[PDB]
Design a protein around this ligand. Structure first.
Ligand SMILES: *[C@@H]1O[C@H](CO)[C@H](O)[C@H](O[C@@H]2O[C@H](CO)[C@H](O)[C@H](O)[C@H]2O)[C@H]1NC(C)=O
Length: 13
C-alpha cells in the first residue's frame, strides 16, 4: 500500500 500505490514515497524524515 502507498509506496507500491506509487503516490507515497519521498524523503519526509
Ligand atoms: C520527497 O522529499 C523531498 C524533500 O526533501 C522532495 O523534494 C519532495 O519534498 C516534499 O514534497 C513536497 C515538496 O514540494 C511537500 O511540500 C513536502 O513538504 C516536501 O518535504 C518529496 N517528493 C515528492 C514526490 O513529493
Amino acid at each position: 500500500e502507498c509506496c507500491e500505490d506509487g503516490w507515497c514515497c519521498t524523503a519526509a524524515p
